[PDB]
Amino acid sequence: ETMKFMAENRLTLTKGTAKDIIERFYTRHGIETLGFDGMFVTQTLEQEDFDEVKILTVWKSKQAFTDWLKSDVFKAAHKHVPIINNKVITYDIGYSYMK
C-alpha cells in the first residue's frame, strides 16, 4: 500500500553551506497534501571537501512521484530552494519497518 518507492534529490554543495540549505526545507510547500508517505533531509557526515544534502521522499508508487514532478507544489519547492551539483535517483523499497 505505502512506502514502496523512494526518490532522492542529491545535492553536492560547497562545504559549510549545508545548514542554510536544509532549513530551506522546513517549509515543504504542501507536498503532504498528495501517495506521499514522508521525507527525510540529511547531511552526509565526515565530509571534508564538499557537503552533501539528500532530500529523500517515500511514496506508495513510482507514479505518485512522477505525478508530483508535474505538480505546482513541486514548482514552488524547486523555486524556493551553493549547489554545485544536483542529481535525482529513484528506488524500489523492497522492505520497510517503521516502529
Add this chain to the structure above:
Amino acid sequence: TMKFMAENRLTLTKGTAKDIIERFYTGIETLEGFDGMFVTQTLEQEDFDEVKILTVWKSKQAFTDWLKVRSKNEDESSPIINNKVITYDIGYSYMK
C-alpha cells in the same frame, strides 16, 4: 526521534540484486534509539546493481552502541563488489 541515519550501501554485479536482497529484509527494533529501516534497490542502474539498507536512529549514539555479507575480494563467488557504510544527520523529516 529520527535524527540520525546509517546506510549500508552494497554494489552488486548487474542482475544479482533479485535474490540476495531478501536476506536483509530480516531484533534491532528492540533498541530504544532505533526508529526504523528501509531496504532499497536502485532503479535505472546501468552497469551494476545497488542495494541500500537504511536505518534511522534517534541519535548517532544509538547506532554506535548497536554496532559495538562478504565481498568478492574474500569469496570470489560473492555478487557483492563493494560494501560501504555511510552516516548522516537527519536535519528534517516528516512522515505521513
